[PDB]
Design a protein around this nucleic acid. Structure first.
Ligand SMILES: [Ca+2]
Ligand SMILES: [Ca+2]
Length: 427
DNA sequence: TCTATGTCGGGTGCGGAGAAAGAGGTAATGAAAT
DNA sequence: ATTTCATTACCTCTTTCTCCGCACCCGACATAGA
């Protein structure tokens, strides 16, 4: 039971406003599979604000500094949040009125304002007199009573408050990568031009990538750093592959050019300016990743200082947003920084600069391995790497008793779908 | 007369490295509930 | 006699924010096609 206007993520990949979902359509299941709707719960009740927490500070001090889009939804007071919480245990040692210990996060119960007995996690202490192997055992056990390193459980907004203090902070929600896979990049290509296949959609994507970053906004041409040979080469090789030919430099690709019939066809360039089309967020993952590599080789530097990551820049909002979702559909974590439209004495006019940040170790490394940049590339993950739903902490603020719009999932499903934003919610 | 692709000039985007702020995790510590 | 909880101060880990100029881009126009 959400708020009127809350954007959902339809099964086919689309996006619709909860307030339009008709009984018999299919929302997006966290695993990529459809969730059938049958009941459309409606009515009023006190609402709740759920918004992610972020080390964003800018707006607090200065006003008119754009507010950060940040993952949020507004549900009713009884709605079940799909939360998660770490299984922790620390051996604290202490002295009371005169005279070890083992504190843990356990699965427990607690009394609500009403009779209601809600399940949830609570900090549990248990210690004996200093006057050895006990506290050890009292732990080893907790460590060997499960594989999961967390508890997956649900809790209604109105009950979060009953949560402890330690636990309450340790508790976070999640947003699942978009595993669904459309083939709107594939069918397009084949649905057109006298193409050459086997890696077609690939090199295409990579180039489609570059272009976005370093590519003139009126034709299939682009800059490349002469110093980076691997890149220099990748374009060459790839160009050849697509069946086309070749400080800083501009490289043109002449054969009636495929690339252009892409930058147009799939709408990478929208009525004049550049833009990472939406569809891309829900097409063959690989494709996605490639398209990213390109964009990373083109414009975005990489570092490992504090764990692998890649920062991309740009001033067109279209690209901003577009990149955001795409990276977010890949299960990469992403935050956006915006630089003001400063005007300097050195006589210059600067516009609002957006710097998109991305991280995720193994998930990212799988992108960077497909890159050519001398300084961008990173060897692919040895074995299989996680593409697990990403967690996030959040604030909850009480609200107005307003109307709610809801949908109930088939009496036989995970009862969890993805909101357009990709945050996992319970029906 | 009307679409691509050389190529030329003023000015802005964003390239690049870090340091520092926040967030939650850890432990410490005191007083009340069980 | 433990076991329950908040809160506080500090440590760990990532992620926001900034600082500033010059070389790379965008914008334009001419010109070859058609
Ligand atoms: Ca660029
Ligand atoms: Ca570049």
């Amino acid at each position: 039971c959400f708020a009127k206007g809350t954007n959902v993520l339809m099964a086919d990949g689309s996006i619709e406003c909860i307030e339009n979902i008709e009984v018999g359509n299919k929302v997006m299941g966290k695993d990529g599979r459809p969730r059938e709707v049958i009941k459309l719960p409606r009515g009023r009740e006190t609402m709740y604000s759920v918004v992610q927490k972020s080390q964003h500070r800018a707006h607090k001090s200065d006003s008119s500094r754009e507010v950060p889009e940040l993952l949020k939804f507004t549900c009713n007071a009884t709605h079940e949040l799909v939360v998660r919480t770490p299984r922790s245990v620390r051996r604290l040692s202490r002295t009371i009125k005169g005279v070890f210990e083992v504190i843990t996060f356990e699965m427990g119960q607690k009394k609500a304002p009403d009779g209601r007995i809600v399940e949830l996690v609570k900090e549990v202490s248990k210690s004996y007199p200093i006057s050895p192997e006990r506290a050890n055992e009292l732990v080893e056990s907790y460590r060997k009573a499960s594989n999961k390193a967390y508890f997956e459980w649900t809790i209604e907004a109105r009950d979060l408050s009953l949560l402890g203090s330690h636990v309450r902070k340790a508790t976070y929600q999640t947003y699942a990568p978009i595993l669904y896979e459309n083939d709107h990049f594939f069918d397009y290509m084949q649905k057109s031009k006298f193409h050459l296949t086997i890696e077609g959609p690939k090199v295409l994507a990579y180039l489609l990538g570059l272009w976005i970053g370093d590519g003139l906004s009126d034709r299939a041409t682009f800059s490349v750093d002469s110093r980076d040979t691997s890149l220099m080469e990748r374009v060459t090789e790839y160009a050849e592959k697509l069946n086309l030919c070749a400080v800083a430099k501009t490289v043109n690709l002449y054969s009636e050019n495929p690339l252009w019939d892409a930058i147009v066809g799939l709408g990478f360039l929208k009525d004049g300016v550049k833009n990472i089309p939406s569809f891309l967020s829900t097409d063959n993952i690989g494709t996605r990743e490639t398209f990213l590599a390109g964009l990373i080789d083109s414009d975005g530097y990489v570092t490992d200082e504090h764990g692998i990551k890649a920062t991309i820049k740009t001033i067109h909002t279209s690209v901003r947003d577009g990149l955001v979702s795409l990276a977010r559909s890949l299960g990469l974590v992403v935050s956006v920084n915006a630089e003001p439209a400063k005007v300097d004495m050195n006589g210059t006019k600067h516009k609002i600069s957006y710097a998109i940040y991305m991280s995720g170790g193994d998930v990212l490394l799988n992108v960077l391995s497909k890159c050519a940049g001398s300084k961008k590339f990173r060897p692919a993950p040895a074995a299989a790497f996680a593409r697990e739903c990403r967690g996030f902490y959040f604030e909850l603020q009480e609200l107005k008793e307003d109307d709610y719009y809801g949908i109930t999932l088939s009496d036989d499903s995970d009862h969890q779908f993805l909101l357009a934003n990709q945050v996992v919610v319970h029906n």
